[PDB]
Design a protein around this ligand. Structure first.
Ligand code: IMH
Ligand code: IMH
Ligand code: CA
Ligand code: CA
Ligand code: CA
Ligand code: CA
Lengths: 301, 304, 300, 303
């Protein structure tokens, strides 16, 4: 499976990228970077940290846009750390090295990849700002992409509070949801993250040592575990888990047509509607396989 | 003055491009196209028709985006004609020739120009689509642009396409909001629909859009004919007034205000430009030198 | 208890102010305003909004300085919406009315109050600028104040990032900490708030309706809950909770001497050192009494 | 010219204040006091002496802040004497009389003067604590001030109290940085410590600081006697040069470089003025008309 990754690489993005790196069936052809919550300069550095912590370093990193399309970024008190990646120490990992960054804008490089790579998939882990612009510049190119895997949205389960990716750039989410075919789109929603939430203190796979990747997992997740009683709502790792393992990862899903509310009190929320040609919105995951996948990426290779 | 022009080349767009074509102190470095008055393909041919009629086809034309940012499209063939240029006949002008269209997308073309052309200015005569996309991709690039001259909005709150919204900013309000909160409004000069109505002309007391004797006079007469009838004999030279201000600078303005502009992005007033006084906002032209304006429109039509 | 409140009234300021209005043992004798979460002008409006929704507008409101002492802007400008109070609609709350401002500067007013009010306590929910200036012009007046309750600093294992008040003006914080007696100071730290936070998907006390105050709390906190994964980090409300309810609110604290790092890579941080003549740094709170106090002020 | 003076009146302040008093086109509308060369309490006493010696005590005097904003009062090897004015005897000058001191704090009186007096200029001869605090409280008010004249700093990197940094800006660096980054540096002239050592006379080649015949010459002679003895008999008239520029305009200035100044509020070298070229920065006087300087220094001592 060929896969492009779009990320605002915070803590859970890095574990999601690591899930893809840990499966030999996955060839990551490029990683695009978008700002917003975490600054774009910080995202590019954190993608570099993740790839350097892993073995393979032959993946081009592209910087995209610096802000949502139109909505304000809404300043963020990053309690987990200012660098957007748990405030880890580069000297503890051997990643105090120059960051790699391609010259091409992420929008154009994504378009070229879409034009020149057959059976290209994309895993989107961030606000869809980069994707919406590429669909605007060249809808013919992005429509060649085989399938879309997106972390975003909150459908009715009650609809939990706190969905981030689409609320951060609702116009971009609408551009994606109105242009790329929803039938070819698979959603790992914030409702799914909240539904498969667990306490990391009941496990040990976020608190291991013995290799660099294990230390990375433990140190990046450390502040999230501390400040929230151990509770974890896995969003991006679940989206990578679904993109990488397919129906093996899915227990139940619902076909739903999705739209963004761009006006009024419900601005930035989503409308969902049963529709066999709509998004595949995953409802239940193989959680036993998910935590097994989380441990395996930290095994000695 | 090096100038970039972004147009949905309708009838008044083309007359604005002739104003810039007619002044030798103006260098048009490239023309970006966007849907609006008509569809993007019609705009591209309309610009080609305009350049061919004038006779200086050495200006690159770039195809922009195919739709607004988020809004559905808003073609008005009952105003600018089915082809966006008054449904003229190409045999009346000798423009039955292939159209020039460069390979590079207008957004990437404009970003490049802002990066390699010094003291670049832009004249924006159409919905804020190509420009907003380019400010999102490369703000550091587009902020290199010396000044922004934009036809759009209405500080009165009196629109055309809606009671509250001017067409270009109502056709893509998010794009209009993107420009107004990203490019420095202090380096931005606005020729609104307010200005277009205030400095409007009665086409049966003024005949400068009704001459023959040369190709330019025929082009201007035939293109403006359907829109003059649609307006009731009235001419609201919105785009030509914006080019007038960009080309002729201070001596084109009679009264202007410094106003911070912001878009109404929802509700029945979608597309409305709110205005409030601010010495760091946009120079919103209130009165143009109508006398010098008609003068330069006649001079580009003279046989000499 | 007579209480002065120094605030940059963002969203959690307004709820902290409501905790003081809801307790009959508390007499708010004056509210000073400083920039921070919002501009000084926006802070004055938001205090006016909070007092009007409650209904006890008989409180003087003074405007302070317009910037931190030495630092340039704010490390986190425009944090609680464009208006500083979650961009609420005045027409929904009936607060589109003339706002009250007093005309003496907030510094001179705090100096006057500390010189004329016996047993005056002060609650500081914002960057230490108004206080540092008044301490620099009349320390004789400010030291008469009975006790200081300050939201700020992050002490500690693990230290949560993002502390605003002392990072926004580290000189003002150091002025206060080395001039007003720390033994008469009680701290609700950013560490305490982070470790005493709630998620809207587990607790509903900021998602109620049925009267004006419940609507004010829900709408103000709404964009915080929406853009922070549901996380409610109630820093200023915890400070007010400690100031108003005292020993009932505190489960554990430590006597620590606090100073500011004013140079180097660690600019804006807080050095803590065990010291029985230092500030009372609250470490644990009665979370159950706190959630009930939040709900109590929202009763019909 | 309407002029407000902020002083830590040591010896060279008093001569500078006398420079302003001597010119009839200058209107001193108020003198604010701050700790520096000596205690605030001595500064208030030392301005009173200076006005009594001249003979015009109709100028209001305001006590300012008791300490720097952030820094400690720090070691003052009392070079201006124990009392701050060369340890002179009031019985020798007829100044054994009550002092005058206004009720208002200097910060509030400065704010009020800025809001109610047209075309007010300020002359700063001391650590800038009062001005920064008034800038903190009312930028609206202090920006109505036409021009700032400030003795302080050293754009050459050669201070006095520290090898880097001049006394007035080393004594309160945060306040000096507040003034620079809030009051427009283009409306600011600087008599630097570069300037005080540059235009520095040896006292044994002039007699303008060793005269009698009237009370003003005795005051000047007795107050400068200690400061002259410290140096190699040299005269680095820091304060008086600043007053000379503020009063006598362009003819006071010979060569002047527009430079943007900023403060090092950190590190082993603490309290120095970072100098860089800036057309919109301070007007740092580099050379003063020394001949005209000595003549007005003599004339103020006339009968
Ligand atoms: O009556 C009109 N209604 C809508 N659009 C236009 C235009 C076009 N829209 C813009 C004016 O709003 C201008 O660029 C012009 O090309 C002219 N007249 C009208
Ligand atoms: O040797 C000195 N060391 C420290 N301060 C001064 C001063 C005082 N400090 C300022 C010059 O540094 C000036 O205003 C003056 O009043 C003169 N000479 C010295
Ligand atoms: Ca993410
Ligand atoms: Ca047009
Ligand atoms: Ca606050
Ligand atoms: Ca002095």
């Amino acid at each position: 499976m060929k896969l492009w990754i779009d990320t605002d690489c915070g803590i859970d993005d890095a574990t999601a990228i690591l899930i893809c790196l840990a499966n030999p069936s996955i060839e990551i052809v490029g990683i695009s970077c978008i700002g917003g919550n975490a600054s774009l300069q910080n995202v590019i550095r954190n993608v570099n940290r993740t790839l350097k912590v892993w073995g393979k370093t032959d993946i081009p990193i592209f910087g995209g846009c610096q802000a949502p399309l139109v909505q304000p970024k809404m300043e963020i008190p990053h309690i987990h750390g200012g660098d957007g990646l748990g405030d880890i120490n580069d000297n503890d990992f051997g990643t105090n090295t120059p960051n790699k960054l391609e010259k091409e804008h992420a929008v154009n490089a994504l378009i070229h990849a879409a034009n020149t790579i057959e059976d290209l998939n994309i895993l989107c882990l961030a606000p869809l700002t980069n994707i919406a612009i590429a669909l605007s510049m060249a809808p013919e190119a992005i429509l060649k992409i085989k399938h879309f895997y997106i972390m975003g949205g909150a459908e009715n389960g009650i609809t939990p509070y706190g969905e981030f990716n689409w609320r951060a750039d609702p116009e971009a989410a609408q551009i994606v949801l109105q242009t790329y075919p929803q039938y070819q789109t698979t959603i790992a929603s914030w409702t799914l993250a909240v539904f498969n939430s667990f306490n990391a203190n009941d496990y040990d796979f976020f608190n291991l040592d013995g290799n660099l990747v294990r230390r990375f997992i433990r140190e990046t997740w450390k502040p999230i575990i501390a400040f929230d009683g151990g509770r974890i709502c896995p969003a991006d790792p679940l989206a990578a888990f679904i993109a990488v393992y397919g129906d093996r990862a899915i227990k139940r899903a619902e076909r739903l047509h999705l739209s963004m509310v761009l006006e009024g009190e419900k601005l930035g929320m989503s409308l969902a509607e049963p529709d066999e040609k709509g998004c595949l919105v995953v409802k239940e995951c193989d959680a036993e396989l998910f935590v097994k996948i989380l441990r395996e990426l930290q095994d000695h290779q």
